[PDB]
C-alpha cells in the first residue's frame, strides 16, 4: 500500500522523480553523480569547496538576498557531499513548491562563485579541517579508505588535503562545476506533499538548461599512534560487493546479527561495484586486542555456525530499519535521489521485503564465507593502539583452524 515512486526524464537527462504523500511539507533535492571519486588529485577539494560556495549567491540572486528568500518561506536548506554523490536539498511547505524548485535551479546552474567568498570559504574550510582532526571516527574511517583503496581515487577524502584547499581557483571550480554537473547525471527528487505533474512542469520550466555532456581494495594497515588520546578507534573492513549486487541485502542481515568495546558499529559502505564491509569500535587501550578477538570470532561464527533464530532476528531488525527510515520526507527524498543515481530506479519496499524473506541461514553463511572468510582486511587505528595486533594476527583471526 506504499505509493510508488514515479520517474520521468527530460531531454536533458535529468530524471525528475517524485513520491507524493499527504504530509504538507516536502523535501525537494537535487542529486548529482559527482564526488571525490571523480576528482584527479589536482582538484581534490573542488566538490567540498563548491558545496561551501553554492549558498553564497548566484547571478540572478546576488549574495545573502538568495538565502533571504529561503528564510522568507521558512524553508530549510541543506547540502552534503560523499565520495560518489552530492546532494542539495530543501525542506519546505507544499504551497511553496515552485520557488523552491527555482531556487534549486540557481544552485545547480547560474551559480556565482565570488572571488571574495573564495578566500573566506578557504579560511572556513581550512580551519574546519585544521579542527576536523578532532573527530576521531572520521579520522579512522578516512584512514581505512586510504589504506584500503591505495593508489585509487577512492582513497582521497571528500575534503581533500589542505594543500589543494589553499591552491584552488574559480576556474578550477568552474571546471568541476561544468564537468561534473551534467544533466544526465542529475536527479530532481521530491518527497511528500507534491504532485508529479506539477514538479515535472517546474523542471521543464527551470532546470531544463542543464548541459548534456579500476576500483581496487588493498588488504593493508594504517596505524596512527598518538598515546595522549584517552580512547582508541579501530575500524576493520573487507571488500564490499557494490550497489547492484543483491547479496548486500544478505550482508545487511549479517550486520543486523552483530548490531566489549564501548562502542561497536557495523557498516556496509557501498560505492559503484565496490565497498567497505566491516566494524568500527572505540576502546581503551588495554581492551583493544580482546575486542578484535571477540569481533573476529563473531564473523567466523557467521561464516560457519549461523542458525535460523539469529537470521530471523536479523531479518526483523533489517525490515524495521529500512521501514523506520524512509519515514520522514527528507529521509525519503534522499532515498529517491540515491536510488535513481545508483540503481537507476527506485526499489519499492515490497521488493526489499521479498529480498529479505528469501534470505535464510544457509545462503547467509555462504555469502559471509564468500566475503569474510580468509580475506585480507584493511585496518585503521588511531589513539593508544600499541596493543592493537599487527597484520599477521588479524589475518590469522580471519579464519579458523577448525573451520
Amino acid at each position: 500500500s506504499v505509493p510508488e515512486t514515479q520517474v520521468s526524464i527530460l531531454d536533458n537527462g535529468l530524471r525528475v522523480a517524485s513520491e507524493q504523500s499527504s504530509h504538507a511539507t516536502c523535501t525537494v533535492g537535487v542529486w548529482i553523480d559527482a564526488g571525490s571519486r571523480y576528482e584527479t588529485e589536482k582538484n581534490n577539494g573542488a566538490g567540498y569547496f563548491l558545496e561551501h560556495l553554492a549558498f553564497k549567491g548566484t547571478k540572478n540572486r546576488p549574495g545573502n538576498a538568495l538565502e533571504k528568500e529561503v528564510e522568507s518561506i521558512g524553508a530549510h536548506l541543506n547540502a552534503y557531499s560523499t565520495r560518489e554523490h552530492t546532494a542539495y536539498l530543501i525542506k519546505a511547505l507544499s504551497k511553496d513548491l515552485p520557488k523552491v524548485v527555482e531556487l534549486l535551479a540557481d544552485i545547480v546552474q547560474n551559480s556565482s562563485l565570488e572571488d571574495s567568498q573564495i578566500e573566506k570559504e578557504r579560511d572556513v574550510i581550512l580551519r574546519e579541517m585544521q579542527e576536523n582532526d578532532a573527530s576521531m571516527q572520521n579520522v579512522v574511517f578516512d584512514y581505512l579508505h586510504a589504506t584500503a583503496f591505495q593508489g585509487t581515487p577512492l582513497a582521497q577524502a571528500v575534503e581533500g588535503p589542505s594543500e589543494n584547499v589553499r591552491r584552488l581557483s574559480r576556474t578550477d571550480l568552474t571546471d568541476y562545476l561544468n564537468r561534473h554537473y551534467k544533466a544526465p547525471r542529475m536527479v530532481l527528487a521530491a518527497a511528500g506533499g507534491v504532485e508529479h505533474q506539477q514538479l515535472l512542469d517546474l523542471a521543464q520550466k527551470h532546470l531544463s538548461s542543464v548541459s548534456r555532456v579500476p576500483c581496487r581494495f588493498t588488504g593493508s594497515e594504517i596505524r596512527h599512534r598518538d598515546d595522549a588520546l584517552p580512547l582508541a578507534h579501530v575500524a576493520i573492513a573487507v571488500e564490499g560487493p557494490g550497489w547492484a549486487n543483491p547479496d548486500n541485502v544478505t550482508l545487511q542481515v549479517a550486520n543486523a546479527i552483530i548490531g566489549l568495546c564501548q562502542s561497536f558499529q557495523t557498516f556496509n559502505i557501498s560505492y559503484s561495484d565496490t565497498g567497505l564491509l566491516g566494524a568500527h569500535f572505540v576502546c581503551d587501550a588495554m581492551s583493544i586486542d580482546d575486542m578484535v578477538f571477540f569481533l573476529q570470532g563473531q564473523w567466523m561464527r557467521l561464516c560457519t555456525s549461523a542458525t535460523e533464530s539469529e537470521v530471523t532476528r536479523g531479518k526483523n531488525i533489517l525490515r524495521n530499519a529500512l521501514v523506520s527510515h524512509l519515514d520522514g520526507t527528507t529521509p525519503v527524498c534522499e532515498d529517491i535521489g540515491r536510488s535513481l543515481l545508483t540503481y537507476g530506479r527506485r526499489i519499492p519496499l515490497a521488493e526489499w521485503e521479498s529480498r529479505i524473506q528469501e534470505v535464510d541461514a544457509q545462503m547467509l553463511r555462504d555469502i559471509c564465507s564468500k566475503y569474510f572468510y580468509d580475506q585480507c582486511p584493511a585496518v585503521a587505528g588511531y589513539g593508544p593502539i600499541e596493543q592493537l595486533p599487527d597484520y599477521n594476527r588479524i589475518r590469522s583471526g580471519m579464519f579458523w583452524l577448525r573451520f
Binding site: 582532526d133 596512527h224 599487527d390 597484520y391 599477521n392
Partner: protein, 54 residues
Amino acid sequence: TFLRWASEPEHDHRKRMGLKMLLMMGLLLPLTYAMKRHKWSVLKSRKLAYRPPK
C-alpha cells in the same frame, strides 16, 4: 676396506640416509624461508612516518 666395514657396518646405510636428508633439506629450506619471508614481509614493507601536529 674390510676392516673399515668392520669398524662401521652401517657405512652404506647411513650414506643413503644422508642422501635423503640432503634432498629433503633442499626441498624444505627454501619453502620454510618463503613462509618466513611471507610472515615477515608485512613488517619489512612497513613504512613509518612522523607527523608532529605542528
